[PDB]
Design a protein around this ligand. Structure first.
Ligand SMILES: OC[C@H]1O[C@@H](O[C@@H]2[C@H](O)[C@@H](O)[C@H](O[C@@H]3[C@H](O)[C@@H](O)[C@H](O)O[C@@H]3CO)O[C@@H]2CO)[C@H](O)[C@@H](O)[C@H]1O
Ligand SMILES: [Ca+2]
Length: 145
């Protein structure tokens, strides 16, 4: 299926056109080493800081009218709080909350059945880290159902 998110797996090694807000210093795009850390390809978003941190990773997409689903893949230190949110599509915001549970214990947050009526959507991932927390984010998808 066509994936409507741009640079959805960070495989350029760069964020663009994703935007980072909040504690930008906690988050980078890396060539995964070991490569296990990425869900697909060679690159992933990696976050870490030695003090508590809060950031958002987001991308806006203009879409043909239709019904969509979005998700991504993450793993990280046991206890990191991550949220996936969708907004601005015509209905109220929807979110999913996940906890990472340890290295390579992959989680796949997903929101389905999003009827896009405004011709656009905003995809936002929120990360709330404790001091020393870390994790990886990769392999976004935005598909028309
Ligand atoms: O569990 C033993 C193994 O740990 C691996 O390290 C894991 C990740 O590969 C690594 O990225 C992560 O490191 C954190 C963060 O991602 C990184 O940016 C930052 O610099 O350090 C953070 C840790 O303080 O740590 C986990 C730990 O399980 C090793 O890759 C592997 O060789 C092996 O030691
Ligand atoms: Ca990737």
């Amino acid at each position: 299926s066509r994936n409507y998110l741009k640079n959805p797996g960070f495989e350029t090694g760069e964020f663009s056109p994703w935007r980072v807000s909040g504690d930008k210093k906690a988050v980078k795009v890396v060539k995964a080493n070991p490569s296990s850390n990425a869900h697909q390809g060679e690159y992933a978003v990696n976050f870490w800081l030695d003090e508590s941190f809060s950031f958002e990773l987001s991308q806006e997409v203009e879409l043909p009218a239709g019904v969509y689903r979005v998700g991504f893949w993450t793993h990280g230190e046991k206890g990191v709080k991550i949220a996936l949110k969708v907004s601005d599509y015509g209905g109220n915001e929807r979110s999913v909350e996940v906890e990472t549970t340890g290295w390579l214990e992959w989680k796949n947050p997903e929101i389905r059945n999003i009827k896009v009526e405004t011709g656009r959507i905003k995809i936002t991932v929120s990360v709330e880290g404790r001091a020393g927390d870390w994790g990886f984010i990769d392999d976004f998808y935005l598909f028309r159902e």
